[PDB]
From a paper:
The nature of the absorbing species at 422 nm was further investigated by soaking co-crystallized E268A-NAD+ crystals in mother liquor containing 2-HMS. When E268A-NAD+ crystals are soaked with 2-HMS for 40 min or less, their single-crystal electronic absorption spectra show an absorbance maximum at 422 nm, as was observed in the solution-state titration and the stopped-flow assays. The structure of E268A-NAD+ soaked with 2-HMS for 30 min before flash cooling was solved and refined to 2.15 Å resolution. In this structure, a continuous electron density between Cys302-SG and 2-HMS-C6 is observed, similar to the thioacyl intermediate observed in the wild-type enzyme. However, in contrast to the thioacyl intermediate, the density around C6 is less flat, indicating an sp3- rather than sp2-hybridized carbon. The angle between the plane of the carbon backbone of the substrate and the formerly aldehydic oxygen is 55±9°, compared with the angle of the wild-type thioacyl intermediate at 26±4°. More importantly, the C6 of 2-HMS and the C4N of NAD+ are very close (2.4–2.8 Å), making it unlikely that the hydride has been transferred from the substrate. Taken together, these data allow us to assign this intermediate to a thiohemiacetal enzyme adduct. However, in this work, the E268A mutant is shown to accumulate the preceding thiohemiacetal intermediate both in crystal and in solution. This finding suggests an additional catalytic role for this residue: rotation of Glu268 towards the active site facilitates the hydride transfer from the tetrahedral thiohemiacetal adduct to NAD+.
One enzyme in particular, 2-aminomuconate-6-semialdehyde dehydrogenase (AMSDH), is responsible for oxidizing the unstable metabolic intermediate 2-aminomuconate-6-semialdehyde (2-AMS) to 2-aminomuconate (2-AM). On the basis of sequence alignment, AMSDH is a member of the hydroxymuconic-semialdehyde dehydrogenase (HMSDH) family under the aldehyde dehydrogenase (ALDH) superfamily. The complete AMSDH model includes four polypeptides per asymmetric unit describing one homotetramer. Each monomer of AMSDH contains three domains: a subunit interaction domain, a catalytic domain and an NAD+ binding domain.
Author numbering:
A (entry chain C), B (entry chain D), C (entry chain A), D (entry chain B): 18 to 500
The structure:
Amino acid sequence: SQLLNYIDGNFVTSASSFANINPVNGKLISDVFEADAKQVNEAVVAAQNALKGPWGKLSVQDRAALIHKIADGIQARFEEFVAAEVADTGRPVHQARTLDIPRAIANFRTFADLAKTSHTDLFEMSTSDGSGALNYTVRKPLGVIGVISPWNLPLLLFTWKVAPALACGNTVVAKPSEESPSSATLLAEVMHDAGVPPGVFNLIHGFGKDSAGEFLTQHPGISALTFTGESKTGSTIMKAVADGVKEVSFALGGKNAAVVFADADLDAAIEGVLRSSFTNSGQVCLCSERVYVHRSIFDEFVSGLKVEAERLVVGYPDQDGVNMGPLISHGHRDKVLSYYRLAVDEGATVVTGGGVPKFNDERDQGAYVQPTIWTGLSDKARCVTEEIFGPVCHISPFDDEDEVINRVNDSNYGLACAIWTTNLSRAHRVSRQIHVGLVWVNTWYLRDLRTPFGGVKLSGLGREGGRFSMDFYSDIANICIKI
Amino acid sequence: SQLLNYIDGNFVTSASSFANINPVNGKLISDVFEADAKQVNEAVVAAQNALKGPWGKLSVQDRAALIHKIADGIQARFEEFVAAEVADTGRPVHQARTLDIPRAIANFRTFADLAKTSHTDLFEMSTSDGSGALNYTVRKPLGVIGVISPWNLPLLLFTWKVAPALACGNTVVAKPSEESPSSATLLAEVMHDAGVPPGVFNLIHGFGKDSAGEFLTQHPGISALTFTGESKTGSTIMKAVADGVKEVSFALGGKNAAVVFADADLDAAIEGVLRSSFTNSGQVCLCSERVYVHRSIFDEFVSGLKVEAERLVVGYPDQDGVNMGPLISHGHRDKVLSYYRLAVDEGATVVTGGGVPKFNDERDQGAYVQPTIWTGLSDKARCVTEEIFGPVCHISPFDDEDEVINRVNDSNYGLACAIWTTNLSRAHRVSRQIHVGLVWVNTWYLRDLRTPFGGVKLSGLGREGGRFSMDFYSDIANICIKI
Amino acid sequence: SQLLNYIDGNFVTSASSFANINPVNGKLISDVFEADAKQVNEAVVAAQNALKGPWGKLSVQDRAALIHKIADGIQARFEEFVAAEVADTGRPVHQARTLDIPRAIANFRTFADLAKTSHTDLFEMSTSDGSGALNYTVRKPLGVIGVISPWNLPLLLFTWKVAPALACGNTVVAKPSEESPSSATLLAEVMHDAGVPPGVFNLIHGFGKDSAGEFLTQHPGISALTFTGESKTGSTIMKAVADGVKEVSFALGGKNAAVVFADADLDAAIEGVLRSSFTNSGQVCLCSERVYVHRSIFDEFVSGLKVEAERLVVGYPDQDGVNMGPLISHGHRDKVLSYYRLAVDEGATVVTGGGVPKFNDERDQGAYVQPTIWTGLSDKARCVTEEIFGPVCHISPFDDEDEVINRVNDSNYGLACAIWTTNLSRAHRVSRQIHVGLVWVNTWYLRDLRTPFGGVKLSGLGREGGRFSMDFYSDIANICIKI
Amino acid sequence: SQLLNYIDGNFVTSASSFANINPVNGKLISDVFEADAKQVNEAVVAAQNALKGPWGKLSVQDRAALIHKIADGIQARFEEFVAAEVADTGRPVHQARTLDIPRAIANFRTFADLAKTSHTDLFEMSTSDGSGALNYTVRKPLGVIGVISPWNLPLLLFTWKVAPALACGNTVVAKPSEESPSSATLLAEVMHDAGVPPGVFNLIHGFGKDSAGEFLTQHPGISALTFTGESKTGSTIMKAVADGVKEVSFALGGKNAAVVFADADLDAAIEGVLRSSFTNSGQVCLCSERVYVHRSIFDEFVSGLKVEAERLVVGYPDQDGVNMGPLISHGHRDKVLSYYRLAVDEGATVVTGGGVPKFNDERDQGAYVQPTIWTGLSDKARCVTEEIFGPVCHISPFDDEDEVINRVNDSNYGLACAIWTTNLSRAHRVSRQIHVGLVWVNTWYLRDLRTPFGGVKLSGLGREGGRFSMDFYSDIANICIKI
Ligand SMILES: NC(=O)c1ccc[n+]([C@@H]2O[C@H](COP(=O)([O-])OP(=O)(O)OC[C@H]3O[C@@H](n4cnc5c(N)ncnc54)[C@H](O)[C@@H]3O)[C@@H](O)[C@H]2O)c1
Ligand SMILES: NC(=O)c1ccc[n+]([C@@H]2O[C@H](COP(=O)([O-])OP(=O)(O)OC[C@H]3O[C@@H](n4cnc5c(N)ncnc54)[C@H](O)[C@@H]3O)[C@@H](O)[C@H]2O)c1
Ligand SMILES: *[C@@H](O)/C=C/C=C(\O)C(=O)O
Ligand SMILES: *[C@@H](O)/C=C/C=C(\O)C(=O)O
Ligand code: NA
Ligand code: NA
Ligand code: NA
Ligand code: NA
């Protein structure tokens, strides 16, 4: 398998390629051509030009219909997309079929639809000569949108950014994670076979620092950079676009909490926290790495969760009943294992997991870890405050509502929080006090694509979703007519 | 006159003071205590703590009423505010009476009202279990807003930021320009007398680099930095807050064009470009420093505008018939004159002005320049491309509508544009193709405070005004209830 | 006390007058001049001409200022409006001071503010020739608004309609209930003193059929009729305006249910039903005259409610601890007691009340009844299905959630419902299935003036409140510009 | 046996049938089964029950997808719908192919998409106890929507009502005009084949008074009546639903003006008024039957219009170059001719037309009239004030802007107006002064489905389109949660 860049409607190679590795078994899936600076520049110049081409003559209806045809194109090759994402990431085949690929199709459909329904504002005003004036606003393409996406939900997160960008009439230069370039390379083919005009969508492969990522980010021809990934990388990008005062949208790290109150459905909460901690092998920005449980139910909670955690089938993506795949890479497994060790040193009681499973097959050449649960760390322990991004959670008891609110908020992160309670007052009283972008009550990672999505503090900047995307990916222009 | 900081409800001095100079005659107005890094810290910490005090517990409608009292308090001392603004900056008294102070009062009233009327969103969704879920959004105080403002329209721009910050329930640490500290200090007196809780509004005086401005900007306790000023300054601030991923809102430099089509009402356009070029002595980010006029009317437009510019009265703030005051400072005048000779060096014809008026009285120790019109520079000339921020405009002919659109857009700035034409289609056709945040047709600087205001490219990022402000100065939070 | 009409900036009498009677003691309070058909004509014509005068030239901001001036005027005569409302209706002074008069003031201010903040819409479209077109909407005054209000909440409901009418720039001909004429007449005094131009606000007194009310609805010069009152009267007015196709907005009767689930806070629910059945002596359209309580707590609820209802103080408006004044009039009391008898005929257990209290003072000549609770009627009983509009509820057990939802919805009315439950899911699940315009959970008649307000089925048509009032009281006009 | 009713999922006949006549030649096209009171009852009960079936359980996304399938179903049978529409109406085949059928399809698609994008509101408030409350709104199906549609744009208008009715989750009982029942009959087959559940969409045929229309209108089981047609019929319908207080939405007659100012593009304006007077043979509610032209261009305008009008090809729907078909029926033709005669009695000059063309073939048996232009009537002539609904316009000169605005607004109708001018100020200054729901500038009948559509005065009640339809076809419910 080989992965090429897609630039101005042509698939091209580079002066250097790098390896894409199947994390299940450590085998090489493909060679990926790393776009160099010159190739990045040629991508940005083509996107700039495509704005003055036929793409720019498209009506909002026709533009939307072509976008639906992109979505149709994915559905047409659906099983191939499942396969690509699995290969790259080792995610359960089932998860890719029901979450990753359908969501990516919905991303285009939703923004196409929004592109047709969205309108702007009329403001009337009086003037000293008694004739008055009109102010109306319009949404225009921002211009060239730089897209840099991570490896955890590769197609889902890539299209979450590309779909609104294109729905708003922009052109795109997009750099998917080095770890998961396949689904995106397939998307490039779909764009091509859909008739998407050359230069409208450009795919560049490579890494971050000193590679395609950084180059995109320093290129003066882009109008915006929308980014999803590590919080320190966001800060880096922010400095990098700062001289050109580019528009920026960041969705970054979390150290998310789940809170289980004494009046929760205990069974539901054990299940809910199971999913929030070990979905995608804990490799979601939204996962609950910290969990607080009311003292009256703490032991029974931990017991129930240890049990459910131990039932999880960690194995082949297509293995019957498989709940967990491996981590994305060996690099990332090193990091996580380091935290596993650090938790021990920090005084943690390992309730379950804490190492790597043994398969006695090619999987031992992969990057699996076990779902871990910890107990017994203080609120200041590095393991409770820093993002690990593995299938792991620490559980602590609490006694008071105000106490636990304060403990959830005592963080430099503020992405999401899940709350469990059956009490109507509590649910609304507590939810509005959590200093994050996203609260779920009695569920987790339930997504309505119209809602504003984003974090506070280190967890991000800006919001995406619904009109928040329609606004971010557009110039808002105000036009004032004296009458 | 002594100008103290206002921190945690107390007026305080500092170890170091600096001079506030009247640009009309170079006289010392006041001494201003420069807040040090320790005092900046006190203000932020106080602002943080105010959030958990009585301020935090006010209903939206009680907050709004208090903000109307701030407005009332300014009205009550209207002429003192007029005097302070005039003293600092040399602006004609009439301008201070009609634009400057009324707008600061209106800023507070407009946003107090929006605080009461604004609401958020409800999203219903289906779930696999058929029970559905509810997503609702809420606006909360973002936290501590750092405000840093420029000297050209001091109280107007200061309150443009402080009013929505307070209306959204934030607490504020605000640093007005070192050239224009007086109206902000009077505002702190109004806040005090109005009973605004201590720590809610904090005034820190000083400079930018290695001073109060930079310290505010580096403090980890702020939640956002909103800034109006030079574009390179914006970049610096953006770099400075990057490690903290602070929300940012910037309104930056411009090199705005006016365009006069052959079907313009010629006299209205002459008068209009007069205003857009020389209002506030050209020290408005909105001012037209480039002007394009159709060939068939170029000569007559130029001659008309010359006569009108030479009729402008340049003088004392309360002189009879005065149109223009000085520039803000000797420092700024040096920069402006430097461009004036650059224009000669680049080959411009000086239609008028191009120097300093001679008064033969105390005003000669002030910072006056002449209103200045150039002709004959190419589009690449630095004087046509770089923001001067003085009372100057270069005028150039054009023949074709597309050509002029391209000439207007061929800029690293994109703040505003003014267009003159009596043609219905033209006004809408052309306006939408100008790459700026703000277009005016047959007028200029006519403001409805509900409109989004801001720039593209180097002229800013984000928008303010109406709901754009209400969204920027608020945490937007999505709460999702599984049913 | 003399109550005159106010037509075209003047107070005028009429050829016929009728008695305003204090329901506390049956005493004469005022003579009220009944406008005849000629006078209603005079009012409408003056209102038509007012739209062409100075009122029509006001900016939105100026119009809003003046309406705030109306609200200042009522505040400055606060206690006079209290006394006027109390004399007409017998309502407790505290209720007048806390709900009635303050809401009338807040109605004016809320819509004044909405007049300032409200804006309209901009829709861009493609055209076959490629040049495109734009559609913008504006709100204009509808024209002359005919207002007809009831006696149960005289000034609150009168101003609920008059405030948005005026705020949207219309002119008004308004006819308060013949039973409660006084506060509306003081309002005409405030309008006059505040310098509202003549013809903008016209007050006409009288009855329905063959009097001022009917003449209003029949007049071709009005543009809309907004009405609050009995459902059958809504129907008559709908027929009356049909030939003119006048805009209509109706808030009508109800037979509202309250539902107490097993998981309810029982003491709170008992207090809340006490309030929802007997506030204003049950003479609120939102009152709960049907109550359903889970069988498991039915006996305990009914006992608790009996105790609380029997502690209600029935007496003078300023009597210490007073909970209930009299009914509006002897005629209304006749209706209510005839229902008290009917309930017994239909087989009800009279839990408490069911007659008139004996005072041994002037109150015996008034129109008092006792607060009254019934048990043991079928869902088909007339007393359980017909609106009584007095201080009464019937309580009935239920077993199942779907059952009680069907029972509540089983009605020709659908104004409001109140639900008691501490369970998060139940609150949202059940609320969305009640076929009414207004649900409260764990409270009753809590009003945010921005929300849509109205009923379904016989309880109304249209909604008012927030932008719904702003839309109803305005012509919405679409203007399409081919570019 | 040709055109059957469609009730609870079955095509059924009726006791009595009536003739459908082709207006090209007076021949029988089909027999139509007239639904009786019993069958109208069955349809309404079945629609009531369908709300409780699976249609009731569809998610908003599935409901939308299903509506897109109805649309696909029409597209699949495109030319069959074209032929049915042409057969009933005589409309040119090109008009059917480009306007009628595509618009019908776009109706279903636009509202399906709005169903998925539309959201509601969240309002936060403070309370006495310091805990606060939430108010949130939801859109629910109104219930059974009764649709009564006219014959002039049969499928377009029928689906303009049925699409948002179905998109908001309602069920429908719809009665197309006796004159044009074929396309609606095919639509029922498309619903059937798409698997729309039984009772969700019901088609009943017949007349107004004493037939299916009147019966639908009086049935206690509908929740709303949306109607398009003559004003007097709107009035009758308004009275009929009055006892039930059913929600109503009316788009009624007009007597629309076009205004041509001296600075218009004269050739565009002639073309423009030629389209607005004579499209669909003047059988559009939006047609200009009154035309006002500035005296300086009056004779030239009239001369130009005459030439263009006499170039119109009046004939067969498939006739090479055809512009206009017949009127809908003999009875309508008699009406129009009656006006043609009345116009002469009122002293008009017949610039062109005024009678029936002599074809010397089977068209002479159809219902054709000539396109007609009058001059010389007074503003009070019946022919200038009463809607004729034929291919005719009267043209009158004017001198002053305020004069022509008054004469335009001097009407009991107020549906639409067209203005021709190239002047920027005039366009916006004049458009806002015309008392109609819809204004076009330099065009006519250009429709964006998002925009509010409706009239003032006799021309209608309420607005449809965009969110206006989503609100009318829904219950709006406010739910308030005490916290
Ligand atoms: N876009 C707008 O709406 C708008 C409005 C007014 C002025 N401006 C721009 O402002 C400029 C002229 O005004 P100016 O001289 O006051 O701008 P400026 O950049 O010189 O300074 C503005 C403010 O920033 C502070 N500051 C300077 N350096 C700083 C630093 N390193 N860190 C933190 N704070 C710092 C200053 O003390 C001052 O308060 C022009 O470019 C003009 O277009 C823009
Ligand atoms: N405002 C708009 O959007 C619009 C659009 C198209 C046409 N129209 C109007 O349609 C009119 C032409 O309508 P028409 O000639 O179809 O006659 P019509 O308006 O009387 O009939 C229209 C529909 O109403 C039904 N109907 C008639 N009388 C009824 C009754 N008493 N009860 C219940 N239903 C009844 C008919 O059977 C038919 O289906 C013109 O006034 C024209 O302006 C308005
Ligand atoms: C973080 O890893 C999760 C992000 C999810 C979204 O961006 C999404 O569901 O759209
Ligand atoms: C009147 O004949 C025309 C009505 C048109 C519409 O209602 C529409 O285009 O939606
Ligand atoms: Na990998
Ligand atoms: Na100074
Ligand atoms: Na009375
Ligand atoms: Na026919």
